[PDB]
Amino acid sequence: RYTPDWPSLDSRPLPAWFDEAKFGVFIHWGVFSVPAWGSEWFWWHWQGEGRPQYQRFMRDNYPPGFSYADFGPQFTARFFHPEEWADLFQAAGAKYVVLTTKHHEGFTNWPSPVSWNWNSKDVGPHRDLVGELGTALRKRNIRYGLYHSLLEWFHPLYLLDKKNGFKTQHFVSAKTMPELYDLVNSYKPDLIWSDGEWECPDTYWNSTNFLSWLYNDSPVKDEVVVNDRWGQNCSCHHGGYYNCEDKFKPQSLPDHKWEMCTSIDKFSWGYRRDMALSDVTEESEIISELVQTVSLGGNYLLNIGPTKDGLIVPIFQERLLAVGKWLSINGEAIYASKPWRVQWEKNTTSVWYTSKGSAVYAIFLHWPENGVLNLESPITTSTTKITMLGIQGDLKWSTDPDKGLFISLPQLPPSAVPAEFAWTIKLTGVK
Amino acid sequence: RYTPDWPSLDSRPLPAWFDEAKFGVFIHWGVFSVPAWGSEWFWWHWQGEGRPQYQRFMRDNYPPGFSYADFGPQFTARFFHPEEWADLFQAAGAKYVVLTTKHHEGFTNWPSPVSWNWNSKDVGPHRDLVGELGTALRKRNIRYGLYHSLLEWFHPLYLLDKKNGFKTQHFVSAKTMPELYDLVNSYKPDLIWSDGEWECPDTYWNSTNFLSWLYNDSPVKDEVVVNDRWGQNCSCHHGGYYNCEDKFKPQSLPDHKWEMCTSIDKFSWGYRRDMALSDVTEESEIISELVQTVSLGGNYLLNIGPTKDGLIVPIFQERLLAVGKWLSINGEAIYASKPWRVQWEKNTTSVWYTSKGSAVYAIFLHWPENGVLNLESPITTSTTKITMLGIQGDLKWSTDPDKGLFISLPQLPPSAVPAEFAWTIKLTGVK
Amino acid sequence: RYTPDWPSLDSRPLPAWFDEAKFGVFIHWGVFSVPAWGSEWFWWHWQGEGRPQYQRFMRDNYPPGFSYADFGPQFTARFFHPEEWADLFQAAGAKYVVLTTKHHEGFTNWPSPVSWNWNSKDVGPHRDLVGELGTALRKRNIRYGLYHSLLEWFHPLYLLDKKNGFKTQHFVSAKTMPELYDLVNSYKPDLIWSDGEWECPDTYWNSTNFLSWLYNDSPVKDEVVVNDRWGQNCSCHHGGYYNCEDKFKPQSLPDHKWEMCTSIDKFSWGYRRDMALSDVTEESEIISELVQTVSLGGNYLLNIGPTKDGLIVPIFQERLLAVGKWLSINGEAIYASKPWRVQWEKNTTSVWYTSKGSAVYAIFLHWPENGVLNLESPITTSTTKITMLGIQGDLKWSTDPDKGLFISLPQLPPSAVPAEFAWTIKLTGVK
Amino acid sequence: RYTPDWPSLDSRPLPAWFDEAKFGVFIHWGVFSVPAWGSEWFWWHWQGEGRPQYQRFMRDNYPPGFSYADFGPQFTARFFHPEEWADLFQAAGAKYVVLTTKHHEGFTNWPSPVSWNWNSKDVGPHRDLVGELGTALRKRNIRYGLYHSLLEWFHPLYLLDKKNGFKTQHFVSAKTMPELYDLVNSYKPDLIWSDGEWECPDTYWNSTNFLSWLYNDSPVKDEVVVNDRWGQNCSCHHGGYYNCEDKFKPQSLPDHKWEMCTSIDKFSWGYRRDMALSDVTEESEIISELVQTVSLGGNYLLNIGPTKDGLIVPIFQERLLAVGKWLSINGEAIYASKPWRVQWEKNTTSVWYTSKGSAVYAIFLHWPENGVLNLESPITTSTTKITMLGIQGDLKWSTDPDKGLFISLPQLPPSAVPAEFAWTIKLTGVK
Ligand SMILES: *[C@@H]1O[C@H](CO)[C@@H](O)[C@H](O)[C@H]1NC(C)=O
Ligand SMILES: *[C@@H]1O[C@H](CO)[C@@H](O)[C@H](O)[C@H]1NC(C)=O
Ligand SMILES: *[C@@H]1O[C@H](CO)[C@@H](O)[C@H](O)[C@H]1NC(C)=O
Ligand SMILES: *[C@@H]1O[C@H](CO)[C@@H](O)[C@H](O)[C@H]1NC(C)=O
Ligand SMILES: C[C@@H]1NC[C@@H](O)[C@H](O)[C@@H]1O
Ligand SMILES: C[C@@H]1NC[C@@H](O)[C@H](O)[C@@H]1O
Ligand SMILES: C[C@@H]1NC[C@@H](O)[C@H](O)[C@@H]1O
Ligand SMILES: C[C@@H]1NC[C@@H](O)[C@H](O)[C@@H]1O
């Protein structure tokens, strides 16, 4: 039993599945996919800030007086096939999938009773997107996470609460908390990704009461995990795992379980129709970020943005499928792994360390020119063996009294290596 | 001071303006004007009942999966000019105008905080229709009435309350009562036309508390009037004036102030684009209904339906303008008048009686063939004079010992009478 | 046999049906009904002249860069029911119906091979409007007339011909003449209403050759009639009957058969959605114009504009049905009638004369105040009888040596005369 | 001077620029990009064949009765930036760009006088796409080619000609030939890519007369090249260069200059919105096809399909940019090269030969496992030198009396070779 207070809530141990997953897929999907321009913050940039570029876009592409709510019917999503999405996520090696049920626009991707005529069922897709995707993912043993934004930019009740200094709680009692309760009682989420919390304290959001109910009497109380975005000054301080800032890149090992969320599109989480090839993150960068995150004990959350028709564009599919291809070879060093005592060598070619049981894995992202890999951290005693996942046969290794360990990598012809951006060396009998 | 109970609320005397008005204009305007087919009950007939004709209409006119909320953006109302509306209503002789702020579809014609993205400001017209029309009417000294429907067909909270047997009040606390309070505190209505009450008791709707607040602390407490649609079994029993049933035609004088509401379109209150000329009420019928209603002490509420562009079609304009032309001649017998002791003759050519001070007015709708009007009710003593509003000179009259009074009407050439469907005889010095 | 020259073509006697008809209905229907604003000259006023009001309308109602061709798909005409149209035209007393097959916009209302993807079949209604209306009218013994505009405002071939001083005939050989031949060989028209001819001579338009072919080898050679709009300076000089100018009102009897075309809407031939009641021609004016036209030996062509959905608005229906109601009483003086030797009295109350066999008809539009009608033209000898169509019994009449004839009209109560705007006196045995 | 006959026309020598180009970019862009489903043959599959899948797509995505012409306004192309297109084509190494001016749908991408209201200027983009792209490409010294389809599926004049057995030429005189003349006299094309010719003989299409005019009096007579699609049985027999069949892969060296046209999308030339990653041609396949085509003396024409908004999707950009990256290293073996005397080794690892002056280039697509490349065709005499484009320093080579030549390739670490799918060896002093 837990009580509605942060010292009690923070003592809950994390379910082991989240740590063992190490790789999830983030989906940003909503009405913002209809303009598909600028970012998922289109409504705020256009109306809340009045940026001239967004006003020009609306002037040139839509009749005068066009409002953001008019985007609703245009969110047709007539090519959405959740089974294909789930198959792609499985082929990408993803262990969990986090879908945005509601973003700052306030448009819920499920039939919310408190979001009437502003949900995916009443207008637009005329479907329960959250339920369909959840069914498809549960059929393939993939964990489900629901992204919920606490705030809404232009909701009148939230604006009224903000005008009152958040001394009233009309918005929380009307929309936010009922939506969270409905999202938990149905679709039975494994993960809750909270957002939109930087404007108000946790007392206003009623976060402690909801978290106590979730941990005590919710149907998912046993194996649910939540992030740290539950109010002002709550990041990296309160919650299940720490998301900290977006695209978080710690320099050392954090003392709490964390997760780095990053987007394949460098300038938007939602889909952009005019996205250039340069805006797309390179695959070597994605694999390097995954390796560095997993080596430092964190989870990796890669984001894609579907189109308004419910399709994942071929470039995102290529990136995800190449991630999955690399994982199909180097997953023994990633899934259900733990950070080692070093996790990266000081003077090296960017070698990163993971551990699993008695096995140590050194992932290097740059083939040495001399053809010999230098590992000055490991200590070999009697029965050290080298594997080099994907290549058969134990490699040759030599010890040095002043230097460390030198391993002769197997020279291979071009376009003949199982991986192309990173390689894993497996050492057994190494302390 | 009044208390939240019907015996206390029913004791409030009616403000005299409503009785002195005797003629108002009803406006049914909303999202149902976009399909403009069948009636304003389009959503219920299509989805709540599944009538094959409405399903066929939606199949033939819209893409598959089209929902009622998608009609929202199409409610452009780009030709709405409230000043022209107010000028037409003034030229029609209307003393008050009742506009539907929200109908059973739940779409509010003003920026309701509890109807986010389902109101005339967020979607569709992108305007506050109620406020603009109110400003235009207040500039011309025309009283304003707000029509509010208590129920909504497909609102999830109302459906939940109905499922619980109306033992919960989620819908009332969330949408209905806040909307009524906002409609009263802004736009300062002179009339409240309640509707959508036949499914629930007044206790569920919180009608007594709202009416007590309206009569005690509202800004319009002094001169506001309400109808009788405040719950189950409330018609003709509770409220300011009695609307009773739609198109109410009493046979005798009612003991409570009442109002007959009727529509120029015989088959719909909302606008229909395929309305035939036969569906349009004849002008003689409209004037006859007005005369019979005013003679029986009731008010007359004539309804028009604007198009989705905010225009009043020429046929409705012609009907209203001919009503106003007749009133410009015969308004001395209508405005600020009272029912007489007879109000209609038993054996006549449909003569109806009104009174004002010491003057009696006999409105006849059929010119007698003999050219002599027979009035067996009035009693002349010494100084009886006949006026015949619109015609100069006192007419000749004769008394009979067994019969009543015979008045020689002024014979006139065709297309030369001020009125064409009804004529008024004014008698002074008549008991 | 006729030859391609005006002296030969003008000698063709008119088929008697056109003279015996005396009343037709004009239909202006096309892509211009989609904007339904300003007039049917919307495209020219907007793009060919650049009037600021039309540019403002397009700015406020459509996205930037919207072109006139984009109006094409919006011409849905999904409520078009030609049988209802034909029934209304029959109930209006119309003997022939002239529909615009193609206007200056160049959009053909039939599947024209030379107007690909710019016709009612390929885009918009997806129907052959001309064929459907023709079938409906032929089922009810109503004559069919096809309105064809020779010019098109923005057709590139016509603009090229105009640039060359009309010394080339690319437009005529490509579009105009093939369209006329297709319109004649199919739908077998009884009338051809030519238009759009004021910019070019008849030699450019190839009018003489087409008319010779029509009179010699066309399927309708026996009973086809054409108007006078076949080139520059051709009005009132060349053609079957003379339309002269639009809304032609001769002061005396013309020496050639003519036709007055007028529109119920005073400011447009096409439909206008914001048309006011004042813009609608009064019914007394319509009946007066018909009487004056028929008395002067001309035909009367009343125009209506259907909406983009294919509906005739209730006000146009009311005007047409009241015309038909008046005709149902006074058609003996109109249909198959001839102008008399006087046709109107010099000093009267606007009495107009028609003749049929030995019967003379005096239509008066103003009931005399004295109750006696003065007819100073007719001469009675021995067996003169008075009928007063719609009223039973011969009226009383008296002759004067210095004055003319005095007829005692039957005094009637208000709202009891068969007609309300004009009355007909029938005199037999009158020279 | 040339005469309108194939023996005279086929004797015209090809301008040297086309042979020296060796790589062009094909653009399929039109109204078919609006449905973006199935292929660019959407109209024929839907209406000309009635395939159930296309009918189902139209049923589910558009209102009933939707026609192909209604797609016209939806072709907005509001993100089309020809300068970005030209920059991408330059960065892809393309020497010429062929854009579809008109496809079988009959929709012209320029303001055609004979395609009124069915062209990119009157409807849809409201632009001259051909002119804008031509200006952008001419600014960057890239040759321009216009793709013109002779036939149109549903044009009434073409259907009439087909019904008559092509004994009439209404379609050719009305649309096809004027469009070709306008396309030549404006935009001054360097290449003409004819299509849609398999149904009619060249006599019907007037191909010989047009080609004689093009070679004699056209503004581009000096340096224009045409393909072989000018009538029935004209492929590989008549015309400038031979396209033969689509995706032509000869097994031996052809005796006439040819060109292989292939599409990055394996199942469509036009853009498909639901195209899968598997449907996208792999980059190694593209480079292999280019190498095999250039080695056999042909040109390579790679096709992309822009979206209806005028954007090139990131996957097509990635494929083109990687082609350009490979060309930036291996263009000395491709541009302005000639087929050698062998062009491929019988027993090898798929080595292909090109020649330029005294230099021979051997492109191999598979790194040998032994690390030694075997070239049994070349003969070294005294001064043979090896270059290996992209790698500095002459490689070591050895001759054999019974075998051929063995070259020791420079062993390199993974992800360190300038190219990744093919490598070029340059031999000088080799006969
Ligand atoms: C906060 O939570 C408590 C208990 O869960 C509840 O009683 C209260 O109504 C909630 N307040 C709001 C504003 O949601
Ligand atoms: C009913 O009215 C009372 C007093 O006006 C208020 O306290 C109560 O909350 C209301 N109930 C609902 C369901 O609106
Ligand atoms: C004019 O008519 C003649 C004969 O009908 C025909 O030969 C000629 O081609 C026509 N010219 C045009 C421009 O239509
Ligand atoms: C074919 O070309 C010749 C000469 O170029 C021309 O006279 C003739 O009209 C053309 N025919 C067609 C059908 O285009
Ligand atoms: C994941 C990111 N968190 C912050 C929010 O503002 C962004 O839109 C993304 O959702
Ligand atoms: C005035 C009428 N009252 C009942 C309601 O159901 C109708 O739609 C009208 O509003
Ligand atoms: C009948 C009228 N003739 C002239 C034309 O310009 C108008 O549009 C009408 O068609
Ligand atoms: C290039 C190809 N040639 C044949 C045509 O049918 C296809 O659509 C493509 O244009």
Coordinates of N, CA and C in Angstrom, one line a residue, chain A residues 43 63-73 78 104-107 112-114 116-118 121-124 126 152-157 175, chain B residues 43 63-73 78 104-107 112-114 116-118 121-124 126 152-157 175:
Chain A
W43 N -0.4 24.6 -33.5 CA -1.4 25.4 -33.0 C -0.9 26.5 -32.1
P63 N -8.8 28.7 -46.5 CA -9.6 29.9 -46.7 C -9.5 30.8 -45.4
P64 N -9.7 32.0 -45.5 CA -9.6 32.9 -44.4 C -10.6 32.5 -43.3
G65 N -10.2 32.7 -42.0 CA -10.9 32.3 -40.9 C -10.9 30.8 -40.5
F66 N -10.1 30.0 -41.3 CA -9.9 28.6 -41.0 C -9.3 28.5 -39.6
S67 N -9.9 27.6 -38.8 CA -9.5 27.4 -37.4 C -8.9 26.0 -37.2
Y68 N -8.2 25.8 -36.1 CA -7.6 24.5 -35.9 C -8.6 23.4 -35.7
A69 N -9.7 23.7 -35.2 CA -10.7 22.6 -35.0 C -11.2 22.1 -36.4
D70 N -11.2 23.0 -37.4 CA -11.6 22.5 -38.8 C -10.6 21.5 -39.3
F71 N -9.4 21.4 -38.8 CA -8.5 20.3 -39.2 C -9.1 18.9 -38.8
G72 N -10.1 18.9 -37.8 CA -10.6 17.6 -37.3 C -11.1 16.6 -38.3
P73 N -12.1 17.1 -39.1 CA -12.6 16.2 -40.2 C -11.5 15.7 -41.2
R78 N -7.5 6.9 -43.2 CA -8.2 5.8 -43.9 C -7.2 4.7 -44.4
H104 N -1.1 18.3 -26.5 CA -1.5 19.6 -26.0 C -2.6 20.2 -26.8
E105 N -2.9 19.7 -28.0 CA -4.1 20.2 -28.7 C -5.4 19.8 -28.1
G106 N -5.4 18.8 -27.1 CA -6.5 18.3 -26.4 C -7.4 17.3 -27.2
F107 N -6.9 16.9 -28.3 CA -7.7 15.9 -29.2 C -7.3 14.5 -28.7
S112 N -13.2 9.6 -25.6 CA -13.2 10.2 -24.3 C -14.6 10.8 -24.0
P113 N -15.3 10.5 -22.9 CA -16.6 11.1 -22.6 C -16.4 12.6 -22.3
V114 N -15.2 13.1 -21.9 CA -15.0 14.5 -21.6 C -14.4 15.3 -22.7
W116 N -16.0 15.4 -26.0 CA -17.0 15.2 -27.0 C -16.8 16.0 -28.2
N117 N -17.0 15.3 -29.4 CA -16.8 15.9 -30.7 C -15.4 16.5 -30.9
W118 N -14.5 16.1 -30.1 CA -13.0 16.5 -30.2 C -12.2 15.3 -29.9
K121 N -13.0 9.3 -32.4 CA -14.2 8.5 -32.7 C -15.3 9.4 -33.3
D122 N -15.6 10.6 -32.7 CA -16.6 11.5 -33.1 C -16.3 12.2 -34.4
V123 N -15.1 12.6 -34.6 CA -14.6 13.3 -35.8 C -13.3 12.7 -36.3
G124 N -13.0 12.9 -37.5 CA -11.8 12.5 -38.1 C -11.8 11.0 -38.5
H126 N -13.0 8.5 -37.1 CA -14.2 7.7 -36.7 C -13.8 6.3 -36.2
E152 N -3.5 21.6 -21.9 CA -4.0 21.9 -23.2 C -3.9 23.4 -23.4
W153 N -3.4 23.8 -24.6 CA -3.0 25.2 -24.8 C -4.2 26.1 -24.7
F154 N -5.3 25.8 -25.4 CA -6.4 26.8 -25.5 C -7.7 26.3 -24.9
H155 N -7.7 25.3 -24.1 CA -8.9 24.8 -23.4 C -9.4 25.9 -22.5
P156 N -10.6 26.3 -22.6 CA -11.1 27.5 -21.7 C -11.0 27.2 -20.2
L157 N -11.2 26.0 -19.8 CA -11.1 25.7 -18.3 C -9.6 25.8 -17.9
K175 N -11.4 17.4 -17.2 CA -10.9 16.7 -18.4 C -9.7 15.8 -18.0
Chain B
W43 N -29.9 14.5 -36.9 CA -29.0 13.6 -36.2 C -29.7 12.4 -35.5
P63 N -19.1 11.2 -48.2 CA -18.2 10.0 -48.2 C -18.6 9.1 -47.1
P64 N -18.3 7.8 -47.2 CA -18.6 6.8 -46.2 C -17.9 7.2 -44.9
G65 N -18.6 6.9 -43.8 CA -18.0 7.2 -42.5 C -18.2 8.6 -42.0
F66 N -18.8 9.5 -42.9 CA -19.1 10.9 -42.5 C -19.9 10.9 -41.2
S67 N -19.5 11.7 -40.3 CA -20.2 11.8 -39.0 C -20.8 13.2 -38.9
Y68 N -21.7 13.4 -37.9 CA -22.4 14.6 -37.7 C -21.5 15.8 -37.3
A69 N -20.4 15.4 -36.5 CA -19.5 16.5 -36.1 C -18.7 17.0 -37.3
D70 N -18.6 16.3 -38.4 CA -17.9 16.8 -39.6 C -18.7 17.9 -40.3
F71 N -20.0 18.0 -40.0 CA -20.8 19.1 -40.5 C -20.4 20.4 -39.9
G72 N -19.6 20.4 -38.8 CA -19.2 21.6 -38.0 C -18.5 22.6 -38.9
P73 N -17.4 22.3 -39.5 CA -16.7 23.2 -40.3 C -17.5 23.8 -41.5
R78 N -21.2 32.7 -43.7 CA -20.3 33.8 -44.2 C -21.1 35.0 -44.8
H104 N -30.7 20.2 -29.5 CA -30.4 18.9 -29.0 C -29.1 18.4 -29.6
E105 N -28.6 18.9 -30.7 CA -27.3 18.5 -31.2 C -26.1 18.9 -30.2
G106 N -26.4 19.8 -29.3 CA -25.4 20.2 -28.3 C -24.4 21.3 -28.8
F107 N -24.6 21.8 -30.0 CA -23.7 22.8 -30.6 C -24.2 24.2 -30.1
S112 N -19.1 28.8 -25.6 CA -19.3 28.1 -24.3 C -18.0 27.5 -23.8
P113 N -17.6 27.7 -22.6 CA -16.4 27.1 -22.1 C -16.6 25.6 -21.9
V114 N -17.8 25.1 -21.8 CA -18.1 23.7 -21.6 C -18.5 23.0 -22.8
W116 N -16.2 23.0 -25.7 CA -15.0 23.3 -26.5 C -15.0 22.6 -27.8
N117 N -14.6 23.3 -28.8 CA -14.5 22.8 -30.2 C -15.8 22.3 -30.8
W118 N -16.9 22.6 -30.1 CA -18.2 22.2 -30.6 C -19.2 23.4 -30.4
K121 N -17.9 29.6 -32.2 CA -16.6 30.3 -32.2 C -15.4 29.5 -32.6
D122 N -15.3 28.3 -32.0 CA -14.2 27.4 -32.3 C -14.2 26.8 -33.7
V123 N -15.4 26.4 -34.1 CA -15.6 25.8 -35.4 C -16.8 26.4 -36.2
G124 N -16.8 26.3 -37.5 CA -17.9 26.8 -38.3 C -17.9 28.3 -38.5
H126 N -17.0 30.7 -36.7 CA -15.9 31.4 -36.1 C -16.4 32.8 -35.5
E152 N -29.2 16.6 -24.7 CA -28.5 16.4 -25.9 C -28.6 14.9 -26.2
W153 N -28.8 14.6 -27.5 CA -29.1 13.3 -27.9 C -28.0 12.3 -27.6
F154 N -26.8 12.7 -28.0 CA -25.6 11.7 -28.0 C -24.5 12.1 -27.1
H155 N -24.7 13.1 -26.2 CA -23.6 13.5 -25.3 C -23.4 12.3 -24.4
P156 N -22.1 11.9 -24.2 CA -21.8 10.7 -23.4 C -22.2 10.9 -21.9
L157 N -22.1 12.1 -21.4 CA -22.5 12.2 -20.0 C -24.0 12.1 -19.8
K175 N -22.4 20.5 -18.2 CA -22.8 21.2 -19.4 C -24.0 22.1 -19.2

